[PDB]
Amino acid sequence: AEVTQLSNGIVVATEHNPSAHTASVGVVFGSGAANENPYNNGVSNLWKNIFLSKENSAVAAKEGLALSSNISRDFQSYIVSSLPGSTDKSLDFLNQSFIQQKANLLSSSNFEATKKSVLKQVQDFEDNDHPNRVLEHLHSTAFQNTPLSLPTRGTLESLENLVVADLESFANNHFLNSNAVVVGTGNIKHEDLVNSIESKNLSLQTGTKPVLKKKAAFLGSEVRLRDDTLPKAWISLAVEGEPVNSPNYFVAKLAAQIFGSYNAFEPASRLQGIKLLDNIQEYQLCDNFNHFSLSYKDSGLWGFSTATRNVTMIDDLIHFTLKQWNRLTISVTDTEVERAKSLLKLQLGQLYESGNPVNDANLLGAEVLIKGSKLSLGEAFKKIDAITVKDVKAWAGKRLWDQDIAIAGTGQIEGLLDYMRIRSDMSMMRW
Amino acid sequence: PQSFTSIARIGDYILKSPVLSKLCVPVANQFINLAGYKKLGLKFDDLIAEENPIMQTALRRLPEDESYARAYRIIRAHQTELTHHLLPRNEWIKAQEDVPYLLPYILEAEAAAKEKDELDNIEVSK
Amino acid sequence: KSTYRTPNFDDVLKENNDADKGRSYAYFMVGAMGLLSSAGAKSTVETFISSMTATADVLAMA
Ligand SMILES: CCCCCCCCCCCCCC(=O)O[C@H](COC(=O)CCCCCCCCCCC)COP(=O)(O)O
Ligand SMILES: CCCCCCCCCCCO[C@@H]1O[C@H](CO)[C@@H](O[C@H]2O[C@H](CO)[C@@H](O)[C@H](O)[C@H]2O)[C@H](O)[C@H]1O
């Protein structure tokens, strides 16, 4: 009823949900793509896929279990889902995969087949997923030569050069008890899980701490992947944002909610209380846009992504959007701040109070790894309601006004002006 | 400049008042006949200046049949005007035909625009 | 070559000495240029305006 957190060597964290009809048990490691290098980039993604390999999944399915794995920038997860009663069967599989097995999943035929699978996977993403590919390039240029610049799926070049040894090296260096948290969500009790874990013994690399490196840094820059054969222009643009556990974490998320998301083809989306919408609908400057406040351990990105077929008016799209951002520093109104509060609460509620145990597992593990605990919506909502117009203006004057930007784009971006023209729009002339 | 919502408000007040109605309407009838637009085959609603968002919204929503009819009256009026003549008496728009066919579309558009403006500037009293 | 592997800009990138060095230098340059141009413009305008004031040969106080 408040999320329990116990440690006996292995940190166990659970979140009991009485309305849930299933249960998820897994392990979340405090290491992701941000802990790789340009040459082993994609190793985590390769691990995810061998864990989700047919051999491993068939074994789990026979037991009535479903496997899930997510590779993020700061973390990595491996979850098993089952009925509330088969919760102990999940632990056995989990125990087996990360303690008993090794040479079973890393066999020549399984590794090569899995490698070939992720290779075609990544190739398709880079070849067809334009909005996400652009967002990945935003991170790449914004944090270039820094941990946060590496794509989570890895790069084709490094992927084709990866061997079983690379996987093992990463596992020995990151899949450690000191860098992990065993999570339990859905319909399960803490005692049931802690005792079932405390039932077994061993340690498997005890006291071993993960590798350390240099911190993430934001660099005003841009990467342009022009492709005149594509039907649209896809653009992502952002300034240095807030890291997780930043004092302005919510103020930044609220600022992003002010401008929000938009889908020109959805009737209700066109009626939102967003001033930018009055400027962009007259000549239909875009098909959609979405503002974000991405937060990581060392840094973050605040900005937006947009897609448009109006290739001759991209300059107006960017101009109007950045002119609106200017407003956060000098003229954002009370009702805009109040509307943002309500919608932010709804966003967080939908994110944290989702009816999915695997989602809760990922969120719970990631947070307890970073701050040792998980913040409740009750506390989050209180912080949000305390945000004032002066807080937004103070934050904007620091993060937005006359600040460097990172830009990424693909498709028909001839109309996207030079860096300086876009950068100049981060402020307004004053007397 | 004066909104039609305002013209209707003032006008309806005069119309619903037995006193003012008897005093103003006859004057208005003579004003309209002296105006002479009906002698050019036009209805009053054809006279409204259309170069503004409200009117463009109204005209776009006007059903096809009436739109084609309005187009004809405007064109015929221009031709008659350039010849410096009036239409033959039998072609004049009759008082019964001088109906406010566009007004309801205009009032609806104005009400929607007024609400948008109000919602765009709403104040929150915490 | 992967588009994710950004080319080298170290030869032009400033070190972690101060993130505002480039900004402060640029803004001083722009500010001083704006300053002298305003003074220049003012002197130029006054030069023309004063050419319309009474000439030296018409100030006869007799
Ligand atoms: C508009 C045409 C005038 C431009 C001619 C420029 C050629 C250079 C010599 C200018 C000398 C004329 C004045 C003078 O002797 O001033 C001299 C000072 O000149 C300057 O500072 C010149 C810098 C140029 C800045 C020009 C800004 C552009 C003018 C825009 C007007 C709207 C002497 O000044 P003073 O009488 O002492 O106050
Ligand atoms: C014809 C001859 C006449 C020449 C006269 C010279 C004109 C000088 C104009 C000088 C300054 O005009 C001034 O410019 C600076 C940018 O440099 C503007 O600054 C604006 O952009 C800068 C740079 O992104 C921001 O830091 C700043 O917060 C913002 O207000 C300032 O608001 C404006 O007031």
From Swiss-Prot, chain A:
The compartments listed are: Mitochondrion inner membrane
Write down the membrane topology: Peripheral membrane protein
* Gene3D superfamilies found in the cross-reference section: Metalloenzyme, LuxS/M16 peptidase-like (3.30.830.10)
Top-level taxon of the source organism: Eukaryota
Does the keyword tRNA processing feature in the UniProt annotation? no
Q: Which GO terms describe its cellular component?
A: mitochondrial inner membrane; mitochondrion; respiratory chain complex III
Q: Which residues form a coiled coil?
A: none
Q: Which GO terms describe its molecular function?
A: metal ion binding; metalloendopeptidase activity
Its main localization is: mitochondrion
Q: Which UniProt keywords apply?
A: Electron transport, Membrane, Mitochondrion, Mitochondrion inner membrane, Respiratory chain, Transit peptide, Transport
Q: Name one Pfam family in it.
A: Peptidase_M16_C
| GO annotation, biological process | aerobic respiration; cellular respiration; mitochondrial electron transport, ubiquinol to cytochrome c; protein processing involved in protein targeting to mitochondrion; proton transmembrane transport
Recorded hits in PANTHER family, A to Z, give: CYTOCHROME B-C1 COMPLEX SUBUNIT 1, MITOCHONDRIAL, METALLOPROTEASE
Write out the similarity annotation: Belongs to the peptidase M16 family. UQCRC1/QCR1 subfamily.
Q: What else is known?
A: Present with 19300 molecules/cell in log phase SD medium.
- Summary of the function given for this chain in its UniProt record: Component of the ubiquinol-cytochrome c oxidoreductase, a multisubunit transmembrane complex that is part of the mitochondrial electron transport chain which drives oxidative phosphorylation.
Quaternary organization: Component of the ubiquinol-cytochrome c oxidoreductase (cytochrome b-c1 complex, complex III, CIII), a multisubunit enzyme composed of 10 subunits. The complex is composed of 3 respiratory subunits cytochrome b (COB), cytochrome c1 (CYT1) and Rieske protein (RIP1), 2 core protein subunits COR1 and QCR2, and 5 low-molecular weight protein subunits QCR6, QCR7, QCR8, QCR9 and QCR10.
Under what name is this protein listed? Cytochrome b-c1 complex subunit 1, mitochondrial
From Swiss-Prot, chain B:
Q: Which family does it belong to?
A: Belongs to the UQCRB/QCR7 family.
- Please describe the quaternary structure of this protein: Component of the ubiquinol-cytochrome c oxidoreductase (cytochrome b-c1 complex, complex III, CIII), a multisubunit enzyme composed of 10 subunits. The complex is composed of 3 respiratory subunits cytochrome b (COB), cytochrome c1 (CYT1) and Rieske protein (RIP1), 2 core protein subunits COR1 and QCR2, and 5 low-molecular weight protein subunits QCR6, QCR7, QCR8, QCR9 and QCR10.
Pfam families (alphabetical): UCR_14kD
Gene name on record?
QCR7
A single GO CC term, please?
A: mitochondrion
Q: Which domain of life is it from?
A: Eukaryota
Q: Which organism is it from?
A: Saccharomyces cerevisiae (strain ATCC 204508 / S288c)
Regarding the membrane, this protein is recorded as: Peripheral membrane protein
Keywords recorded for this protein, A-Z: Electron transport, Membrane, Mitochondrion, Mitochondrion inner membrane, Respiratory chain, Transport
Please name the taxonomic classification of the source.
Answer: Eukaryota, Fungi, Dikarya, Ascomycota, Saccharomycotina
Compartment(s): Mitochondrion inner membrane
Q: Where are the transmembrane segments?
A: none
Q: What else is known?
A: Present with 10100 molecules/cell in log phase SD medium.
GO process annotations (BP): aerobic respiration; cellular respiration; mitochondrial electron transport, ubiquinol to cytochrome c; mitochondrial respiratory chain complex III assembly; proton transmembrane transport
Q: What does it do?
A: Component of the ubiquinol-cytochrome c oxidoreductase, a multisubunit transmembrane complex that is part of the mitochondrial electron transport chain which drives oxidative phosphorylation.
Protein name (Swiss-Prot/TrEMBL): Cytochrome b-c1 complex subunit 7, mitochondrial
From Swiss-Prot, chain C:
Q: In this entry, which stretches build a coiled coil?
A: none
GO biological process terms, alphabetically, are: aerobic respiration; cellular respiration; mitochondrial electron transport, ubiquinol to cytochrome c
Q: Can you cite an annotated GO cellular component?
A: mitochondrial inner membrane
Give the free-text PTM comment from the record: Processed by both the mitochondrial processing peptidase (MPP) and the mitochondrial intermediate protease (MIP). Initially, MPP removes 22 amino acids from the newly imported precursor in the mitochondrial matrix. This proteolytic processing is then followed by a second proteolytic cleavage by MIP, which removes an octapeptide to generate mature-sized RIP1.
Could you confirm whether the keyword Metal-binding appears in this record? yes
Spell out the molecular function terms from Gene Ontology: 2 iron, 2 sulfur cluster binding; metal ion binding; oxidoreductase activity; ubiquinol-cytochrome-c reductase activity
Keywords (A to Z) from UniProt: 2Fe-2S, Disulfide bond, Electron transport, Iron, Iron-sulfur, Membrane, Metal-binding, Mitochondrion, Mitochondrion inner membrane, Respiratory chain, Transit peptide, Translocase, Transmembrane, Transmembrane helix, Transport
Topology feature Mitochondrial matrix, residues: 1-20
Q: Which residues cross the membrane?
A: 21-50
Q: Which family does it belong to?
A: Belongs to the Rieske iron-sulfur protein family.
Q: What does this protein do?
A: Component of the ubiquinol-cytochrome c oxidoreductase, a multisubunit transmembrane complex that is part of the mitochondrial electron transport chain which drives oxidative phosphorylation.
Quaternary structure? Component of the ubiquinol-cytochrome c oxidoreductase (cytochrome b-c1 complex, complex III, CIII), a multisubunit enzyme composed of 10 subunits. The complex is composed of 3 respiratory subunits cytochrome b (COB), cytochrome c1 (CYT1) and Rieske protein (RIP1), 2 core protein subunits COR1 and QCR2, and 5 low-molecular weight protein subunits QCR6, QCR7, QCR8, QCR9 and QCR10.
- Name of protein: Cytochrome b-c1 complex subunit Rieske, mitochondrial
> What's the encoding gene here?
RIP1
